[PDB]
Amino acid sequence: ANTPDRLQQASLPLLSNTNCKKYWGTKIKDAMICAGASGVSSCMGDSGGPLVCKKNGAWTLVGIVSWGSSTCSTSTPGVYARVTALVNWVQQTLAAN
């Protein structure tokens, strides 16, 4: 149980898909975006959570915790679901239902 009782937060940089491909290579698809490899990492229990960046003083959902290293290596980039690529599917679901 290396599960923290209180909510954690970590600051990390967005990687360019190519620099990310230097680690994951073939794994990286277009509905994906990397972040991290800077000494911090998302681990088990973090999935589904937010990767937010500022946009005009408003925190914006840029990614969703998805996958990464099997041992949560802080020097490897974590892979998140790229929201801009999925935001239209969301708009249609929201509008429809």
Partner: protein, 51 residues
Amino acid sequence: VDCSEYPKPACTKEYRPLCGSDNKTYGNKCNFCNAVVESNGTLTLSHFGKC
């Protein structure tokens, strides 16, 4: 547990804990199976959830 698809260099990050017969709690099936291949068969599941 089906661990034939392992080892795997990458795992998803959901928390669905498994207790190994080694008295260690694995965050999910991906990291439990990964450890089952290290031990080369010697690691088994003692039960689901935290140890």
